[PDB]
Structure 1
Amino acid sequence: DARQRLKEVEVDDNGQFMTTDFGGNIEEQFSLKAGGRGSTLLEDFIFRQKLQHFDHERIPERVVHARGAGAHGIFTSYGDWSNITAASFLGAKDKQTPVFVRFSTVAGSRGSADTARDVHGFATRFYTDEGNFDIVGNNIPVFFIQDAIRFPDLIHSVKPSPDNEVPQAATAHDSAWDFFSSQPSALHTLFWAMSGNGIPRSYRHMDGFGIHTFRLVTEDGKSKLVKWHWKTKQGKAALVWEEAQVLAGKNADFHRQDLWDAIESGNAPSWELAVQLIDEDKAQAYGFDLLDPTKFLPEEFAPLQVLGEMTLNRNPMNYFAETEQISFQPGHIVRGVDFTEDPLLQGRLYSYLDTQLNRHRGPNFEQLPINRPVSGVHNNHRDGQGQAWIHKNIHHYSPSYLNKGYPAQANQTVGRGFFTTPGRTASGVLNRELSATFDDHYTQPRLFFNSLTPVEQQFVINAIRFEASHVTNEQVKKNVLEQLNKISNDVAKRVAVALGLEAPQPDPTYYHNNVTRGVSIFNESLPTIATLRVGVLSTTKGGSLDKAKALKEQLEKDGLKVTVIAEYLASGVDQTYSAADATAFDAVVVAEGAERVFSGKGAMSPLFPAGRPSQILTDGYRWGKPVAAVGSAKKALQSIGVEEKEAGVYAGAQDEVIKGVEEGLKVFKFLERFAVDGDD
C-alpha cells in the first residue's frame, strides 16, 4: 500500500460517541438556550467549538492550478542508473518508491470545470529514501514565457478580468490574446493549448513533461543535461471543443471522477518515465538553446530512454488532507539531480517555497502527513506556527562543541549530501537581459503545426477562431493575426476568415516544412480500451432491457464500463435518460427495440426532456464517437440521418456491434466527420 505511512494519522469514528476537539463525549444537535424559546447562551462551549472549526475550514486555493485531483502509487525503476545519476530512487532494478501525483488545469479556480480548455499540470512526488523529489510538470512540453519574472504578467492576463472577474477558466478574452500577441514567446504553448492537449479525454490519457532541461549528476560529479518525459500507457486521447463545453456543464468533475473510478475498479493507470540525455557541450547544438523552456527537443535528435514506470493505484481517503494540502516544489531536489540556468526554472525555486507560506499560513507545512518525507529530518530548525514535533537536541546551532558536531554536515564525499554540479561556472557581467539565443519565437510553433494531422490542424485553427472571435478590441485581433502569420501564412488566412479580417501577406522569415514525431494525438490508436465507457440506450418497454443486459455483460468482460440507460431505474438500468448525456461516454449503442424512444409516443415521456434520446445519439455521432445500433435499433440511426456503413457506425446483430464498437474505440475519434477548410 503506497499510503501505508499515512495509516498512523487515520482516524476511525465508527462505533464511537461524538466528542469536542479536546475530548469528552457530547451531543451537538441543539444550542443551549435560556428557556424554552430562549436566546442561545454564550456558555455553550459545544456550539462554539463546533462552529469555529466549520467557520475556519477553508484555506487559500493554489494561485495557479487550483483545480485538480490526485492519487497515490508506486514508481518502479527498470534498472541501476548510477551510470547517469546518483539519485537513489533510480539506483537499482525493481526498486520501488511511493509516489503521489496531482493533475490539474492552470487558470480556473477551485470549482471550475475539468474540461475547460487549458494547459494541464502533471506533478509527481517521489518519496525517496534520500528525500522528497518532485517533478512538477505539465501535459505540454513548452511554457509560455522565458523568464520567471514574467509569470504574474502571464497569469494575470489569462485569469479573469480584474474588474468583473470574467471569464472563468478560459483564455477566450481580450487580455489573454493581448498578452499572447504582445509577448510572442507564448505562441508555442498557445498552439499546444489550442490542440487536443488543451482538452484531453482524461488525466490518464496525458503525457507529462518536466519542460526544463535539468541535470543528472553521477557520484564522481559528472553531469548530463536531461528532459523528463512521462509516457502514458493508456495512450493519448482528446475531446472536441463543442463536446468539452457541454461536458463542463454536465459533469464539471469529469476528469477527477475518471481517475477515481479507474483506480477503484482495479484499472490503475501507468506511465513510463523516460529521458532525453544531452552532453553539456551540446546545449546549443540543436537549433535552439536548451536553457530556453519555450522549445522542446525533437526526438529525432535525442530519442527517449525509459528508466522505469509509475502506477497510480490508491485513491486518497480524505481529499483535503491529502490532495488539497500537498505542496509540490521544483526546489524539492535530491543528490544526483541539479538545476540549469533556465531563467524560468530559476525563479520557480523561489516562488513555490514562498507560496506555501500563504497557502498553509506558516513555515511548518513539510510536517503535514502528505508532505513528510519517508527519510527523516534532522536539523537545527525550531519553532514556527503549528510546530508538530518536540526536539531533543538543546544545542540547536552549528558549529558546536556541546553537540559533538551533530547533526553533521553532509556533502559530495560525506553523508551523501546534495552537491551542485562541480563543473558549473558563472562568466560575465551581472545583467537584466536574456540571451539572444532565446529570440526565435516562431520556428517551433510552425514545427508543431506541421506535425499534426490535417484534421488536428483544423482543430487548432478552429480553437483559435473560436477564441479570438471573443476579443472585442479590433487592434488586438490584428496584432494576433500579425503574429500568427509569422508562424504560417495559411494559418493566418484561415483564422482571418472567422475574424472577417483580410488575409495578410506572407512573412516567410520563419516558415519551414520540417516535422517531428510524437506530438500528435489522434493519428495513433489507443493501445487499450480498458475503462472506456459505453452508454447503452434502452427502454423499459418490451424486451430491450434484457438484450441491453446481455450486451453489457459481454462488453464488461472486455474491460469496458457500461451504462444501461432507460426512462426510469428499472432492474438493470444504470441511469435515466433525464440524467444521461453523450459527454459521459466514449461510445453510444442503441439496444434492440429502443428505436421506440426516437420517434412516436415513446419519445414523448414526462420522464425526460423532449428529444433526449435522439440528442444523445446525435451528440455522440457529431462528436466523432463510435456509434451503433443492434438489430431493429438501426431505425434510430436513420431517424437522425446517420447511414449504417459510415466510418465508426456499426449496425447489425449483437456480436457484430460489440466487435465494431471495440474496434472503433481504439480509433477513439472518427475525424472524417469534421469539415476541413476547403470542403465547401
Structure 2
Amino acid sequence: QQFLSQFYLNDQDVYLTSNVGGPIQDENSLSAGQRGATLLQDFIFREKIQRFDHERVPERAVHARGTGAHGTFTSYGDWSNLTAASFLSAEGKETPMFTRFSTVAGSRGSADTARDVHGFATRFYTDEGNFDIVGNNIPVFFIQDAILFPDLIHAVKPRGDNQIPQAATAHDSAWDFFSQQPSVLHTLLWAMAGHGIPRSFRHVNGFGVHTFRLVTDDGKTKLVKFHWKGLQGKASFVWEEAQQTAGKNADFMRQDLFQSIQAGRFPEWELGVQIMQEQDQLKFGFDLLDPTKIVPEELVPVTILGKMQLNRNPMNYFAETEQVMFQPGHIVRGVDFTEDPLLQGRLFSYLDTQLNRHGGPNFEQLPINRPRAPIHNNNRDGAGQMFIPLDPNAYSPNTENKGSPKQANETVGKGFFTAPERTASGKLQRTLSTTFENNWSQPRLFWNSLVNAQKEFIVDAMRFETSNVSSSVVRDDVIIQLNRISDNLATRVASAIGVEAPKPNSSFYHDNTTAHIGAFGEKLAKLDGLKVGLLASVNKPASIAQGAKLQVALSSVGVDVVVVAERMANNVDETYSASDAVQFDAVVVADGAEGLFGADSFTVEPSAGSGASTLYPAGRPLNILLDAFRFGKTVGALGSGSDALESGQISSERQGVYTGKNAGDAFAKDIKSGLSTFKFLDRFAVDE
C-alpha cells in the first residue's frame, strides 16, 4: 500500500472544491431570480455534470463481470535452476499481487452465479516488470486458434437482433457453435459440471491453460502448465440453487470475497507447475500446444513453487478493479511463449483492446497498471501523458544522450529474451494441425472420472440448456457429438429433448480416469467464511440466544452464525423477509422457533384472526428450510425445533440432517462435519 497510497484522495472533514482546487458549493444551480432559468456561466454546474456524464468506460469485451483483491506472493524456493524469473529467485521472496476473478459472457451487472467459465487473472508486480498470468478456473478452453474467438463469443453472447439471453449458453447459437466445432466439447463438460457454478471465488482452482516455457539465464527451457491450487477446497452449487442465488443476490460471489478479506479470512492458492521437456510435446498421445487438452497429474505431478494470499480489498472499485488491464504480453525474463495458436493470437488482443477501454495509449500509466520498477524508454506522448520525460532525444542509437537508454538482452542488463533454440520450419499456411484432431478422448476421460451425482449434474445441465434450443438440426447435431464421447451421456440427454437415442460409435470410448477432477466428491479443507443460518423467533428470546451459543462453538473454524427472526431486535442479524436459503451453507431451526414452520403456512387465508404475520411472505420460514434441504445443504434443528423437520417431512435419519438438545460441542461437531461435506449428494436422483 506504500506505492498506491500516493494516489489516494482523502475526503474526511474537508471543504468541497472543484477539480482545480477552488472551494465551491454544489447544491443549487445559478438561476436568473428565484424561479428563473439556469445560467450558462454556472461553471460549477457544468464541471459537476460533465464529470458525471463521462463516468462510464466500455466494459471488457469478455469478463465484464468481475471482482478484484490485492495480495502477496511468497516463493517457496530458489528456482533459478528452472527459471530466471526474479520473483522466484529466493526462498521467502515476496512480491505484491493484484487478482481479478470473473465470469466470461455476461455484461456488467449480470449475476455472479450464472453458469460460465470463470476468469482467474493474477498480476505479480515484480522487480523486473509486471508479470500477468491471465487464467481460468478450468484448465482447457473451447477453441484451438485465437482467430475463432469472435465466432465463439458471438455464439455464446445474446442474439444480435434482441440481445437475449443475458449471461447464458441456453440458446440456439451457442449449441450450434458447440456442435459444429467439436473442439469445444472438453471445456463444455467442465462448464456443465460443478465447475460452471462454483460456490465462491475462494473455492476454485486456477489454470494458465496454455503450455508456457520457463527459461534459465543460460537459455535452457522446460515446458510447463501453470496451476493455482486452492487451499480452501472445491465447492459448487446445483443449477436450481445457482438460479435462485442470481435472483436473491446478484453480488453473491463478490460479496463473499470482500467480506472474507474484511474478516481476515484470507484465501490462499499455491502456484504450481507441471514440468515437462521440449521433447514431450507429442509423446503423451496429444499435442502440448493444444489448449483443449489437460496433462493428467498421473503423468506429470504438480511441483509447488510458492503461495498467493489475497489480503486487501480495493479502496475504490472503479480506480483499481475496473481499470486493471491484464495482458499475457506482460511477460518477464525467465518465461517465454509457445506456439499454441490460441496463446499466439491472445498476445495481439490484450494490447489492442486497452485502447478501447482507456480511450488512448497511456493505460500502463494508471496507478493499478504501473510497475514497481523504473521505466526507461523512448516511447513518447499520446493522450493522457502523465509523465514528463527529461530526455529530448528519444531515439536509439544516439550520442546526444550518451547512448542511453541502453539495450538489454540475454547477456547484458537482464533483458527479456526469446528461448534461443526455438525454430520455425515449413510452409506458411492457414491450416488446422493434424495433431489437434482428437476432440473426444479427453472429454471421455473427464466424464469417466466424475462421481455419479456429478455425471447426473452434467446430464441435467445439458437437458436444461438444449431443451431451450429451438432448432431440431442443432439438437440432433449436439447428440451426435455427445455420442462420440459416451453413448450413455448422449442417450440420457436425448431422452429429455425429443431426439432419437443414437447407436454407439466406439471410436473414442475408453475407461481411463484421472483423480479428483470434478467439483464434487472431496471434503472442504477449510470452513472459513461459510454461513450457518439460525432460524429463530423474537417471541421466544431463548431461540435467539442459541445463536451466540452456536457461534462460540464455531468461531475457531471461521464459520459465521447468522440469526434470522421476524423483525430486527437485539442479537438478530436479518429478518425472514430479507432472507433466503441461498444465503446460508447450513440452516438450523432454533428451539422455540418451530411454530413458524406450520405445514399450512403456504396457503392459509391471511384473515384478521388467522394470526399470520405481515412481517414476511406466507410460508417464508418453511420455504428456507425446504429449499436448504432440496439444494443438498446441511440442515439441523435444536430441541423442539425438530418439530419443524416433521412439518417439512424431513426425516432426521437422512444424511446431513442433524438434531441436538442444545447448541453445545456435540451438535457443533455434527454441523462442522456437515459443512465439510458441503453438499449431500444422496438427495439427487440419478438415471437408472
Q: Map residues 175-194 of structure 1 onto 2, 5 A cutoff.
A: 175-194=173-192
Q: Distance in 2 between matches of 1:632 and 1:549?
A: 18
- Deviation readout 1:257-283 (Å, 9 max, x if unpaired): 000000000000000000001110111
Q: By how many angstroms is 1:466 displaced?
A: 0.6
Q: Does 1:607 align with 2:615?
A: yes
Aligned residue number for residue 194 of structure 2: 196
- Comparing 645-654 with 228-237, greater Cα deviation is found at 645-654
Structure 2 residue matching 1:427: 3-state secondary structure: strand
2:525 maps to which residue? Answer: 527
Which residue is 2:588 aligned to? 589
Residue 538 of structure 1 corresponds to 536
CA contact (8 A) 2:526 2:557 kept: no
Distance, in Å, in 2 between the alignment partners of 1:434 and 1:491 is: 28
RMSD: 1.0
Aligned residues: 676
Q: 1:391 aligns with which of 384, 389, 398?
A: 389
* CA drift at 1:346: 0.3
Identical pairs, percent: 62
Partner of 2:607: none
- Give the corresponding residue for 2:328: 330
Distance (Å, rounded) in 2 between the aligned partners of 1:500 and 1:536: 44
1:363 to 352, 361, 364: 361
1:94 to 92, 95, 99: 92
**Structure 1 match to 2:625:** 617
- Counterpart of 2:231 (choices 230, 233, 237) is 233
Deviation at 1:645, TM superposition (A): 1.8
Which SS does the other structure have where 1:178 is aligned?
Answer: helix
User: Equivalents in 2 of 1:557, 1:640: separation in Å?
Assistant: 32
Distance (Å, rounded) in 2 between the aligned partners of 1:47 and 1:187: 56
For the 8 Å contact 2:16–2:24, the answer to whether it is kept is yes
User: How many angstroms does 1:604 deviate by?
Assistant: 2.4
Report if the CA contact (8 A) 2:209-2:225 is conserved.
yes
Is contact 2:224-2:274 (8 Å) kept? yes
Q: SS at the partner of 2:166? A: coil
After superposition, give the CA deviation of every residue in 1:560-595 in whole Å (9 maximum; x if it has no partner): 111100000011100000000000110001111110
- Letter of the 2:28 partner, please give it: F
Whole-Å separation in 1 of the counterparts to 2:657 and 2:4:
48
**2:665 matched to 1:666?**
no
Q: CA deviation at 1:553?
A: 3.2
Aligned-partner residue type, residue 670 of structure 1 = F
Q: Is the 8 A contact 2:516 2:522 kept in 1?
A: no
Q: Which residue in 2 is equivalent to 1:645?
A: 653
For the pair 1:61 / 2:69, whether they are aligned, the reply is no
Aligned equivalent of 2:420, options 419, 422, 430 = 422
Q: Which residue of 1 aligns with 2:448?
A: 450
Whether the aligned pair in 2 keeps the contact of 1:20 and 1:46 (CA below 8 Å) is: yes
Cα shift at 1:557: 4.1
SS state at 2:548 partner:
helix
Secondary structure of 2:173 counterpart: helix
Deviation sequence 1:283-323 (CA, Å, 0-9, x none): 10111000000001001110000000000000000000000
**Structure 1 portions without partners, runs of 5+:** none
Distance, in Å, in 2 between the alignment partners of 1:450 and 1:168 is 32
Which of 443, 455, 472 is the matching residue for 2:470? 472
Question: TM-score normalized by structure 1?
Answer: 0.99
1:658 Cα deviation (Å)?
1.7
For 1:590, give the aligned amino acid: V
Q: Is 2:547–2:561's contact at 8 Å kept on the other side of the alignment?
A: no
Amino acid at match of 2:83: T
Structure 1 equivalent of residue 561 of structure 2: 562
Q: Secondary structure at the match of 1:418?
A: coil
CA contact (8 A) 1:596 1:603 kept: no
| CA contact 1:143–1:293 (8 Å) conserved in 2 | yes
Deviations 1:500-548 (A, max 9, x none): 2211100110111110113122211111112111111000012311223
C-alpha distance after superposition, 1:413-440 (max 9, x if no partner): 0000000000000001001012100000
In the other structure, the counterpart of 2:105 is: 107
SS in 1 for 2:152: helix
- Matches of 1:80 and 1:434 in 2, distance apart? 40
**Aligned mates of 2:66, 2:154 — CA distance in 1:** 20
Q: Partner of 1:432 in structure 2?
A: 430
- Following superposition, the deviation at residue 549 of structure 1 comes to 3.0
Give 1:381's aligned amino acid.
N
2:639 aligned partner: 631
Deviations 1:317-341 (A, max 9, x none): 0000000000000001000000000
Contact 1:582 1:620 in 2 (8 A): yes
CA contact (8 A) 1:603 1:610 kept: no
- Deviations for 1:426-472, whole angstroms, at most 9, x for unmatched residues? 00100101210000000000000101101011101111111011000
1:279 is matched with which residue? 277
Shift of 1:368: 0.2
Aligned 8 A contact 2:547 2:562 in 1: no
Report the residue type matching 1:21 in the other structure: N
Q: For 1:119 and 1:244, how far apart are their aligned partners in 2?
A: 14
Query: Structure 2: 5+ residue runs without aligned partners?
Result: 602-609
Residue 4 of structure 1: how far off its partner (Å): 2.5
Aligned to 1:138: 136
3-state SS of the aligned residue for 2:426? coil
Aligned partner of residue 564 in structure 2, secondary structure: strand
Whole-Å Cα distance in 2 between the matches of residues 419 and 511 of structure 1? 43
Q: Tell me the equivalent position of 2:687.
A: 677
Matches within 5 A, 1:151-300: 151-300=149-298
What is the CA–CA distance in structure 2 between the aligned matches of 1:484 and 1:587, rounded to whole Å?
36
Structure 1 CA distance for aligned equivalents of residues 190 and 35 of structure 2: 64
Match of 1:577 in 2: 576
Question: In structure 2, what is the Cα distance between the partners aligned to 1:531 and 1:321?
Answer: 27
Instruction: Return the match for 2:411 from 413, 424, 430.
Output: 413
Q: Which one-letter code corresponds to 1:13 in the other structure? A: D
Distance (Å, rounded) in 1 between the aligned partners of 2:547 and 2:647: 20
Q: In the aligned structure 1, how far is the partner of 2:50 from the partner of 2:553?
A: 53
SS of 1:224's equivalent? strand
